[PDB]
Design a protein around this ligand. Structure first.
Ligand SMILES: Nc1ncnc2c1ncn2[C@@H]1O[C@H](COP(=O)(O)OP(=O)(O)O)[C@@H](O)[C@H]1O
Ligand SMILES: [Zn+2]
Ligand SMILES: [Zn+2]
Lengths: 379, 167, 138, 179
């Protein structure tokens, strides 16, 4: 047998490499540069025609299997990591591309949350997945994902990128280099997603709960006269060479707060753990609480894990969660690989198990016969 | 109006105009476009010029304000300075130990220091003094990086003394 | 190919999937009678090579070395093939003036042999987990 | 334009000798060391300097206007000297292009206003796109396209370059006639 390849198709970035390795070999933006198109189209797009999606995935998998990885597709197996409740037609297409065009031996559709649990070694743990599109949580108890007690909110990368763009356009101060030393607002109508992502990573950080709670009430201005903490210094960011955008200190520590803002509904990234944990079985409560896992690149943002764990323990004392989750000890697990590449590492650890892989995985001979991929929906 | 200096291997076949002031040990390559429109072109020793290099002192043609009384704006250039292929330059003051790359458009008022390099095929019209010992790379973005140590180019200049004869 | 606009007049392929492609890109199948596109045809892997130091490596050596050249290096700041410069060797880029001295990697006495990448921090924990799951899978 | 190469009428002033046509406008300072064995074209306002050179060009070589081919200086501890470059067979240097390259391979299409760096080797059957910067001491493999300010692998070329490029350079030469 040969070392099975691991792919993990995401909206922002795709993880790729081989099984039984310390981390992924290639990690790249999930896009393709088609002739005529100035900006490259995104390879994973939900709610489009199958033929157009088929062509994009055919183009992308080709780049992964030749330019990034150097190996024959037909020779060795595949371990496709994809999140639970991934759209039906997308997963059906992705398999149909691998089985028909590339003619792979067998694909294994592992849920990202159960794979993240294997990397630690613990059999039972709560898993939060703060991705690009949606920040999803799914309790895993001793190998069994509990779909009953699922939770998701659109407070990921996309929702954060959009919030940054909005704030920058309000307090817009750019030095074009054409008598634009004076503050010039909205010279460009929209900012490209590639720039916004680079600003987010380098400039913006996650504030402490004490400082963050003041920032929330400050921008609200709820019958108070200038009750904001002192912001960090303003950082100057180059746009397309000559144009120098002066990023305000307030924007850096306020953009993140949309994730941890209550917004009346009581629906934050913090609340989603406690909302799910309260809905879980009464016996499982204390085991899941003690074993928390925080995967996804959105949680890589500096000082996110401290704010989350703090915001949890504050929301615990709130009267809604005070009865059930009152006297619970919330402890976070530190996975071996980085927060972005926890999902991938599980699939590699699973891919190294050649004996179990072949049995669980769906063979091409079965797919060609039936034409029915197994899912958590009815058969 | 020419102040030719001995030791400097300025080639006669290169084009020169205006009230020029030539340096001690400068080496000008053929088809190197030097003009002294308003003020003179002051050249430091070891300031070699390679291929197309538009060095003009035409601030009266650029803006034409009819201001600053006389406004000579004398073009001062430093020592051990490499002008590469197709690089446009117009700097009233320019420091020693700096190497602009090929097809590099330098601004109308940009002051260069030591150990500083402009990116190849990169244009900078905006007026802004360059920090001490920092390099610019790429046209799409500037992406400024501070160098560890300044880079000298003496050996190259010294060898041209042997080549230029009978050419 | 590009100078003359080959991407204008296109030839059609017969089969399941119909594609409009330039004749320059397409291939004729001699075994049968039907020209087929770069898309339609199946791709294989023959040989691996480094784009800087053109050295044909075998398939077995690539798997051990993780599809990389030992001698050649690419700069991290910008994506370009580095060059060895002496004073006793330091690694430097031509496009950007990023050095190996900047990050604080010590100069090596031997040219190529000395340079190495540090071992992965969670490599020991990795093998222990594989062997546990391997026994459990068995 | 749509596969077919278009007409270009040259003026009376041009040095036509043994097939090799060289525009009189275009200076080539150092005629001794530079050599053009085949039926080469050098368009107006182009430079081929003899700064200790040995510039050998192809059978059907083409260099469009405002373009420079200068040899690079090798920074050697023994002796600093200009390395003699060798342009390959059927080489197409595009308009306003800068070339400081040592050993340019055969059957290559160098793009418009693209700066190739010092001591840069190009292997046969490659293509550099327009507005691109190849840094000093870089190599480009066959059937490749290098682009961007970094100057890195963009993709692969069509399989039939060796056969196709012959038609392009020979057609341009044949189509390029006096008025
Ligand atoms: N190392 C990092 N540091 C900070 N932010 C990151 C990092 N890596 C990714 N991100 C951000 O977090 C997001 C993570 O998305 P990712 O988990 O890769 O995608 P998906 O959820 O589709 O699998 C990216 O879109 C990016 O904005
Ligand atoms: Zn190599
Ligand atoms: Zn670099």
């Amino acid at each position: 047998e040969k070392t099975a390849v691991v792919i993990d198709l995401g909206e922002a970035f795709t993880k790729c490499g081989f099984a039984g390795e310390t981390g992924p070999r290639c990690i790249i933006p999930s896009v393709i540069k088609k002739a005529g198109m100035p900006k490259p189209i995104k390879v994973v797009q939900y709610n489009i025609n199958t033929e157009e999606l088929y062509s994009y995935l055919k183009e992308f998998i080709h780049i992964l299997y030749f330019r990034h990885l150097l190996v024959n597709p037909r020779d060795r197996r595949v371990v496709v990591i994809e999140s639970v409740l991934c759209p039906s037609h997308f997963r059906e297409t992705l398999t149909r591309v691998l089985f028909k065009y590339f003619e792979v031996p067998s694909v294994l559709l592992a849920p990202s949350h159960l794979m993240a649990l294997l990397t630690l070694g613990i059999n039972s743990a709560m898993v939060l997945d703060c991705g690009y599109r949606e920040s999803l949580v799914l309790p895993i108890y001793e190998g069994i994902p509990v779909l009953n007690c699922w939770g998701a909110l659109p407070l990921g990368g996309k929702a954060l990128h959009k919030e940054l763009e909005t704030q920058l356009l309000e307090q817009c101060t750019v030095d074009t280099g054409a008598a634009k030393e004076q503050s010039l607002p909205s010279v460009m109508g929209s900012i490209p997603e590639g720039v916004l992502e680079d600003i987010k990573v380098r400039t913006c950080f996650v504030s402490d709960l004490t400082r963050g709670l003041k920032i929330q009430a400050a921008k609200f201005n709820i019958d108070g006269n200038t009750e904001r903490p002192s912001p960090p210094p303003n950082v100057d960011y180059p746009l397309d060479g000559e144009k120098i955008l002066h990023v305000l200190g307030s924007i850096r520590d306020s953009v993140v707060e949309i994730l941890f803002e209550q917004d009346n509904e009581e629906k934050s990234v913090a609340t989603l753990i406690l909302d799910s944990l309260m809905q879980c079985p009464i016996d499982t409560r204390k085991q899941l609480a003690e074993n928390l896992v925080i995967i996804g690149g959105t949680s890589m943002l500096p000082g996110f894990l401290h704010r989350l764990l703090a915001e949890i323990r504050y929301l615990v004392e709130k009267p809604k969660y005070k009865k059930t989750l009152g006297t619970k000890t919330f402890r976070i697990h530190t996975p071996p690989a980085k927060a972005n590449c926890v999902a991938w590492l599980g699939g590699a650890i699973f891919g190294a198990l050649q004996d179990i892989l072949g049995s669980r995985s769906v063979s091409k001979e079965y797919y060609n016969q039936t034409g029915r991929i197994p899912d958590w929906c009815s058969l | 109006s020419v102040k030719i200096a001995p030791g400097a291997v300025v080639c006669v076949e290169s084009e020169i105009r205006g009230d020029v002031t030539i340096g001690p040990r400068t080496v000008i390559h053929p088809k190197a476009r030097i003009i002294a429109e308003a003020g003179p072109i002051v050249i430091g020793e070891g300031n070699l010029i390679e291929e197309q290099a538009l060095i003009i002192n035409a601030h009266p043609d650029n803006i034409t304000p009819d201001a600053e009384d006389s406004e000579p704006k004398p073009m001062i250039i430093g020592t051990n300075n490499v002008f590469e292929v197709g690089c446009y330059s117009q700097a009233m003051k320019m420091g020693d130990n700096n190497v602009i790359e090929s097809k590099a458009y330098v601004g109308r008022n940009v002051i260069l220091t030591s150990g500083c390099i402009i990116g190849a095929c990169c244009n900078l019209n905006t007026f802004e003094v360059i920090p001490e010992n920092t390099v610019i790379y790429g046209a799409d973005c500037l992406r400024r990086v501070q160098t560890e140590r300044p880079q000298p180019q003496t050996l190259q200049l010294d060898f041209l003394m042997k080549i230029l004869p009978n050419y | 190919a590009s100078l003359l606009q080959s991407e204008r007049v296109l030839y059609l392929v017969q089969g399941e999937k119909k594609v409009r492609a330039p004749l320059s890109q397409l291939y004729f199948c001699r075994y049968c009678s039907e020209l087929r596109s770069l898309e339609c045809v199946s791709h294989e892997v023959d040989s691996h090579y480094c784009p800087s130091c053109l050295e044909n490596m075998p398939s077995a050596e690539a798997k051990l070395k993780k599809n990389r050249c030992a001698n050649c290096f690419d700069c991290p700041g910008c994506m370009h093939t580095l060059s060895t410069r002496a004073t006793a060797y330091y690694l430097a880029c031509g496009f950007c003036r990023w050095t190996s001295r900047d990050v604080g990697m010590a100069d090596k006495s031997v040219a190529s042999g000395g340079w190495q990448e540090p071992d992965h921090p969670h490599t020991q924990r990795m093998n222990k987990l594989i062997e546990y799951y391997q026994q459990l899978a068995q | 334009m749509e596969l077919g190469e278009l007409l270009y009428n040259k003026s009376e002033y041009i040095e036509t000798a043994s097939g090799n046509k060289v525009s009189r406008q275009s200076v080539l300072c150092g005629s001794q060391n530079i050599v053009l064995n085949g039926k080469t074209i050098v368009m107006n306002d182009c430079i081929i300097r003899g700064d200790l050179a040995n510039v050998r060009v192809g059978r059907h070589c083409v260099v469009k206007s405002r373009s420079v081919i200068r040899p690079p200086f090798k920074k050697f501890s023994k002796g600093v000297a200009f390395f003699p470059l060798h342009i390959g067979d059927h080489v197409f240097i595009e308009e306003d292009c800068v070339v400081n390259a040592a050993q340019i391979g055969s059957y290559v299409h160098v793009g418009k206003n693209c700066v190739i760096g010092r001591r840069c080797v190009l292997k046969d059957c490659c293509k550099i796109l327009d507005n691109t910067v190849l840094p000093p001491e870089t190599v480009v493999p066959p059937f490749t396209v290098f682009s961007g300010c970094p100057g890195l692998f963009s993709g692969e070329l069509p399989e039939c370059t060796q056969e196709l490029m012959i038609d392009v350079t020979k057609s341009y030469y044949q189509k390029f006639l006096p008025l």
